[PDB]
C-alpha cells in the first residue's frame, strides 16, 4: 500500500516515529504485510480543510484490491481515524481520507513492472 499524509501541523507537532506506527497500523488495517507498506508524511504545509485553516491532515491510501468498495473503505476509515485523531491531536472533523485502487501494471519495482 501507499499512504501519503499532508498536514499543516509543524514537524515538531507530529509525534516522532509517526511514519513507523502508521506503517504498522496500515499493515494490520489493510491486511497487507508490513514489508509491502509505504508511508510518506509531509508536515509544515499551509492547509484549509472544510473551509478552515485550523490544524488538519489529508491521508491518501493507494493499494491493489482492498480499497475499491465503500464497505472495505468504511472499515478502513474507522481504524485510520481512531489512529490519526489521537496521534495528531486532531478532531475527527479535521482529517479526510482518499482511497485510490491501483493495478500491478502501474507499479515500477526494482527496475521492472510485475504483473
Amino acid at each position: 500500500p501507499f499512504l501519503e499524509l499532508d498536514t499543516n501541523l509543524p514537524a515538531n507537532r507530529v509525534p516522532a516515529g509517526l511514519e513507523k506506527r502508521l506503517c504498522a497500523a496500515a499493515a494490520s488495517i489493510l491486511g497487507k504485510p508490513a514489508d509491502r507498506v509505504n508511508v510518506t508524511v509531509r508536515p509544515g504545509l499551509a492547509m484549509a480543510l472544510s473551509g478552515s485553516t485550523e490544524p488538519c491532515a489529508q491521508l491518501s491510501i493507494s493499494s491493489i484490491g482492498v480499497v475499491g468498495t465503500a464497505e472495505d473503505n468504511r472499515s478502513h476509515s474507522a481504524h485510520f481515524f481512531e489512529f490519526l485523531t489521537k496521534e495528531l491531536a486532531l478532531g475527527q472533523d479535521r482529517i479526510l481520507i482518499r482511497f485510490f485502487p491501483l493495478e500491478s501494471w502501474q507499479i515500477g519495482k526494482i527496475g521492472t513492472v510485475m504483473t
Copy 2:
C-alpha cells in the same frame, strides 16, 4: 473539493493567507460550499515545468461531478489561472492544472464513508 498546489517559490514568496483566498476562490469557481473545500500548499520545492526551473506551480483539483468534462474544466481553468498568476506573480506559462474526478466511495470522513 481537494486542491493541492506545489511550488518552487519559497514560502516567503507565497503571499500570506493564499490557502484561505484559494479556498474561497475554489468554492465560487467550482460551485461548491466553502465548508467542503480543502486546499494544501507545498512551497519551497525543487521544480521544472515545461522544461524550465524558473518559478512555477502545479495545481491538482479533485471533486465529485464538476471536474469531469473538457467544457467544465476549461471554465474552471480560466478562473484558477486569473487567480494564481496574480497571487504568485507567475506568467500563465508557469502554471499547470490537473483535474481528477472522485466518487463518494473514495472519501473517508469522520471515520466512515458516505455513499
Copy 3:
C-alpha cells in the same frame, strides 16, 4: 509528463540540479519533448518504504498515451531506476514508481483545456 518525487533524504543529500537532470532523462525515456516535461522534488519528508524508514524515494509519473501498459512501464522503470538509484545513492529496493495515464481534458494550460 508530470513527475513527482518524494524522499526522506534531506535536501542537502539530493544532488543540486536533480530536477533538471530528471527532466532531461524523462524526456528521453518517455519519448516526449523536454519542453513538455514537469518535475517536482519534495525532500526532507518522513517516509517508510517496504516497511523500512531507511532512505528511500517515491516517483509518480503521469502522461498521455505512454504510461498505460505493463510493457511500456517496464521499459520506463529500468531507465528511471538506473538514473535515480545512482543520483540518490539508493539501492533499487528503496525506490518505487507509480504510473498514471492522463487524458488531455484533465490538463488546464494557459487558462483553458486543449482537447
